[PDB]
Amino acid sequence: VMITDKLRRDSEQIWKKIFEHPFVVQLYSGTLPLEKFKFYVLQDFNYLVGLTRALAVISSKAEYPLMAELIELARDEVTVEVENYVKLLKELDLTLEDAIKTEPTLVNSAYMDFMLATAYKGNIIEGLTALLPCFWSYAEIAEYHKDKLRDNPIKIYREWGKVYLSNEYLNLVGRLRKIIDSSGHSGYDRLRRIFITGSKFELAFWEMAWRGG
Amino acid sequence: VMITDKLRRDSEQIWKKIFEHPFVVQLYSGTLPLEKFKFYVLQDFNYLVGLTRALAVISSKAEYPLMAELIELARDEVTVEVENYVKLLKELDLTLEDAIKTEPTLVNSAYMDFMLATAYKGNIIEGLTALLPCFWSYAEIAEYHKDKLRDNPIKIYREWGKVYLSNEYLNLVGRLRKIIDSSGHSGYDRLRRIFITGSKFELAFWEMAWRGG
Amino acid sequence: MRVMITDKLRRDSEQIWKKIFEHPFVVQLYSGTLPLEKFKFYVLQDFNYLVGLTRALAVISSKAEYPLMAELIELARDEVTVEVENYVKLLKELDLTLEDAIKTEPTLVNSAYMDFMLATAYKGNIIEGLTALLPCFWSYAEIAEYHKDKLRDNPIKIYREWGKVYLSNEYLNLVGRLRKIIDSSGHSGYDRLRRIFITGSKFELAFWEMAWRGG
Amino acid sequence: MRVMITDKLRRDSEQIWKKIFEHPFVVQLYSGTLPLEKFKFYVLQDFNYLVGLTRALAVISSKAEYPLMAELIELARDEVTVEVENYVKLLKELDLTLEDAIKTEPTLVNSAYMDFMLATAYKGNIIEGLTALLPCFWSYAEIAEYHKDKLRDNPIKIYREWGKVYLSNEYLNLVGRLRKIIDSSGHSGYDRLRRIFITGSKFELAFWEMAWRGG
């Protein structure tokens, strides 16, 4: 049994809660009030930066060529993805400055600090595992609700969700999983706790997005 | 106006919430069910270790003699304080192993990762500021409730609370504040955000301790 | 009436930069007299440099505020992509492969210099981290400017291609930008910057020297 | 039938450790022939070493699991407390003050070695970090063991006091413990450990050399 499948198995109860979270459900169904979505999208700036910080630390510690592959990903987050994000902000009548000036919630800061902290104290696999719930759950969620997406009345939501269903996104999850699954068999327990914590943060992030605070 | 007094001022609404939190109030009054206290005390192990990790990082980056002073503090947490903690555990019919095997809540892990993460990306003053809510609020809380403490029927709670009223503890807070207050005038806003985040974590920690999860 | 921080860094390291400008390896590389064998030893030692520069930039980036962080990760990214590609093309002209580079044992000097970069990025703020990298970026441009004439007249094509990179406007503008960042910082804490910059400058000299010694 | 990891590290660095055991500075310090002036230059350069060893231990401890983290922070704490006190007493016997030490400019070799320690602690796991510190702790004990006889017969009291520290059971037990931690780790990844240990060993030799050169 591959490490990644084990992690998914041991965090099963939590992912079930992510899949059916009201924010997630309504976003994919199209019922989500645009304002709630805007609040979520503004909190995403901190998320994009945080993800980039943790990836920079992991790459700073990795062997070549992996460090090159990781740095490309970090670069894409604050480059290509920032452009897509600014483009999303436009559609919502918002600007990067609005995002930049948004105050991250405690959960937002906490989640990103958890990613950085794990990258700092842990080896390459531990750091990456702290980011897997993020990458993987976003793909699982869209797959889970794929049917509602086609029936979703809000063009902005359909465009947003289609990203996680794309082959490029899916290939990225595949790569991350592969790096982790091709590693040793020892220390699984540490990996399990890292993954679980990351999964709880995802659930908490969706919750704070819904509460608008 | 000194940096530290400013931080206290800008996080005033939060600290009011900490002072009157049910866990805090009942602990100091003596009405706290022993079980809730035991749950809290078991979560303290992760807190002691996390505090030590963050201090280690801050010292690794500081100039001598401050690095020496900070490492002594880190050393004391995992040595002298572990002994006092084990002694507290005894009084509660618990063992270090019980503490070591306790699973930290998401808030616990989050708080410690915030401390480490801030120590890692920030300069010496930013790292220390991430720890000030911790050190300072524990002293302010006991001062605030000092009157109930002498009227507290539970010996274990009185012993626990007396620590934060002692001259040794108070001197430590004084030192920490001094280091921070003798620093530049620039970057106050980053310090403010760090302090606020740390204060919200304190409130969250008391809340999770009360909820037992 | 106060000059800039980078003006002082150049000012305070003049003697060692002079030794760098006049180092046999450097002088011979730009004149075209360097024995092709010594250049290969140097190029080979460059892999570890390429990777090390990338590691340090990643750490500085991890601690920087946005948008500077993005500007820095882009530079780190280019070191290990665009530049690895160019490095491979250079290796080719010399009948060497990336494999040979990757397998090359870095001299003590090399390891040490890269460690100084990473260590400084880790313990200091971003200005201190970048200052640890300025001797690298800056001296390579100054060296080329210094031997500009000899280059435009160098018999060996590979050496010419190699050198021209540092005289380009893009490379010059990049170093300019790194200096702007350092110079727009606080007036205090100069002494720490000075020691960091001087250490980096010594490593640069040491690097040429070990490339000259072939060990 | 497989020897231990630290057995291999000693095995793979035999030639440079021999040069360390036979280095003039080392040989003369233990025989009692070293000119007191050279010892002072060395002791002076030790402050930066004392601080650097402490920084690297702090980073390793910050990443370690409990209780190893506590064992390591204690060692870091002793470096900057008990040992600074001993170092001050030594400085005194030599008519020097901590102030003189703190104000001493560390040679490039010194800075580099400390940076290698910190950089290794930062990028690698705890075993790799500790392995970067083993040549330090271990070689000092082996050197004393190696020149044991010369020491018990050294004319200069300060040198004798200085040397005896490394023959004590406590010091020997500490190195023993550091080796036990490294040896109870995984069988794989040895090559990384080897390069780290060999780098550290070269720095040790370089350190004596710069102490001998006085620059």
B61–C123 C-beta distance less than 8 A: yes
Residue B93 DSSP SS3? coil
* Optimal mutation site among A123, A124, A185, A186, interface D, most CBs of chain D within 10 A: A123
- For residues C108 and D200, give the distance between their C-alpha atoms in angstroms, rounded to a whole number: 9
Q: What is the DSSP letter of A20?
A: T
Pairwise CA distance, residues A8 & A193, whole Å = 12
Dig out the tokens for D22 from the structure: 């036979």
Give the Cα separation of D147 and D163 in Å (integer).
9
- What is the rounded distance in angstroms from the CA atom of residue A34 to the CA atom of residue A37? 5
Chain centroid, CA D60 distance in Å: 16
Tell me the CA distances in angstroms from B12 to B19, B133, B143, B195, B199, one per residue in order: 11, 12, 16, 11, 10
DSSP SS3 for A97:
helix
Query: Contact at 8 Å (CB) between D82 and D141?
Result: no
**Greatest extent of chain D over all pairs of C-alpha atoms, in Å:** 54
Give me C97's structure tokens: 């492969």
What are the φ and ψ backbone dihedral angles of D107, each rounded to 5 degrees?
-65, 170
CB C135 within 8 A of CB C179: no
Could you tell me if D26 and D143 are in contact, meaning their C-beta atoms sit under 8 angstroms apart?
Answer: yes
Chain centroid to CA D25: how far?
15
- CA D98 from chain centre, in angstroms, equals 20
Q: Which two tokens stand for residue A203?
A: 């659930």
Of the options 3.10.20.310, 3.40.630.10, 1.20.910.10, 3.20.170.30, the CATH number for the domain spanning A1-213: 1.20.910.10
Distance CA D110, CA C119 (A): 13
Experimental determination technique: X-ray
Hey, is B187 helix, strand or coil? coil
* Cβ atoms D25, D213 nearer than 8 A: no
At B207, give phi and psi (nearest 5°). Answer: -65, -45
- Put simply, the answer to whether A120 touches D186 (Cβ < 8 Å) is no
- Residue B186's Cβ-count burial label (10 Å; 0-12, 13-18, 19+) is exposed
Question: For residue B212, is it left (φ>0), alpha (ψ between -120 and 50) or beta?
Answer: left
Q: Which residues of C touch D215 (CB under 8 A)?
A: none
In three state form, how does the secondary structure of chain D look? CCCCHHHHHHHCCHHHHHHHHCCHHHHHHHHCCCCHHHHHHHHHHHHHHHHHHHHHHHHHHHHCCCCHHHHHHHHHHHHCCHHHHHHHHHHHHCCCCHHHHHHCCCCHHHHHHHHHHHHHHHHCCHHHHHHHHHHHHHHHHHHHHHCHHHHCCCCCHHHHHHHHHHHCHHHHHHHHHHHHHHHCCCCCCHHHHHHHHHHHHHHHHHHHHHHHHCC
Q: Which residues of B touch A113 (CB under 8 A)?
A: 110, 113-114, 116-118
Residue D57 carries which side chain, given as an amino acid letter? L
What are the tokens at A190? 């540490």
Which chain C residue has the Cα nearest residue D198? C108
Residue in B closest to D75 by C-alpha: B75
Question: What does the longest C-alpha to C-alpha distance in chain B come to?
Answer: 49
Tell me the C-alpha to C-alpha distance, in Å, between residue B150 and each of B16, B91, C128, C215. Answer: 22, 20, 52, 73
A104: helix, strand or coil:
coil
Alpha-carbon span A154 to A160, nearest angstrom:
10
SS (H, E, C) chain C: CCCCHHHHHHHHCHHHHHHHHCCHHHHHHHHCCCCHHHHHHHHHHHHHHHHHHHHHHHHHHHHCCCCHHHHHHHHHHHHCCHHHHHHHHHHHHCCCCHHHHHHCCCCHHHHHHHHHHHHHHHHCCHHHHHHHHHHHHHHHHHHHHHCHHHHCCCCCHHHHHHHHHHHCHHHHHHHHHHHHHHHCCCCCCHHHHHHHHHHHHHHHHHHHHHHHHCC
Q: Do D69 and B59 touch (CB under 8 A)?
A: no
Burial (CB count within 10 angstroms: exposed 0-12, middle 13-18, buried 19+), residue D113: buried
Q: Does domain D1-215 have CATH number 1.20.910.10?
A: yes
Which residue has 């860094």 as its token pair? C9
Q: Are C123 and D118 in contact (CB under 8 A)?
A: yes
| Rounded CA Rg of chain B | 17
- Please give the resolution of this entry in Å, rounded to 1 decimal: 2.2
- Residue pair C204/C136 in contact by the 8 Å Cβ criterion: yes
Largest CA distance in chain C: 54
C-alpha–C-alpha distance, residues C193 and C180, integer Å: 15
